[PDB]
Design a protein around this ligand. Sequence first.
Ligand SMILES: Nc1nc2c(c(=O)[nH]1)N[C@H](CN(C=O)c1ccc(C(=O)N[C@@H](CCC(=O)O)C(=O)O)cc1)CN2
Length: 193
Amino acid sequence: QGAMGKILLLGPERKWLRDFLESFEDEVTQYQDKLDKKSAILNNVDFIISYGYRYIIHPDIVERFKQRAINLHISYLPWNKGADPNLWSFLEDSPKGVTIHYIDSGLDTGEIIVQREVTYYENDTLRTTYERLTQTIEKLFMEYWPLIRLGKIRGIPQPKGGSYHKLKDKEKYLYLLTDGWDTPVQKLIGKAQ
Ligand SMILES: Nc1nc2c(c(=O)[nH]1)N[C@H](CN(C=O)c1ccc(C(=O)N[C@@H](CCC(=O)O)C(=O)O)cc1)CN2
């Protein structure tokens, strides 16, 4: 390792993250749409970072980039795989936090690289807890990227257990979110048992 590389960032454009990665002398490209395994976007790519990427990455891409593709997920895996992890962490009163993991063929099931718990406070809202998770996982990424960049954390099998949600699962609970993002979380804790 140590050779200048090419990093593909999947998800929304984040100039701060592009700049951070380029300060290590790597070249960066960004993409937010679906990827066929033949896409030229993948040519000559050394490492993939997905952060808010909206699509399932095809298994042939996963295999081609074994141990070279990571995802930033704002849950404490194995809890709250999938959608709306912050909300579900309150509805199901689960552990809360953020996780950097290797991408495998399933959704948010790959090997864990590092995680961090994130606590909440009596008067937090979904907005304030979401923002804290976002800041925490961006911090955790930058804290550990100098090591990850050089293959120094091989990851561990994702513990068996936890939970998984699809985007539609929250519909029967939306009536609790009377103030949208500014709903106090206290109103939500345990409401899905
Ligand atoms: N193979 C793979 N692709 C990955 C991830 C992963 O761990 N493995 N992490 C991210 C997972 N992700 C976002 O970061 C993401 C994007 C879209 C959907 C999706 O398509 N959801 C629908 C149906 C899903 C299903 O049927 O299983 C839904 O919620 O209803 C799910 C998760 C991005 N792509």
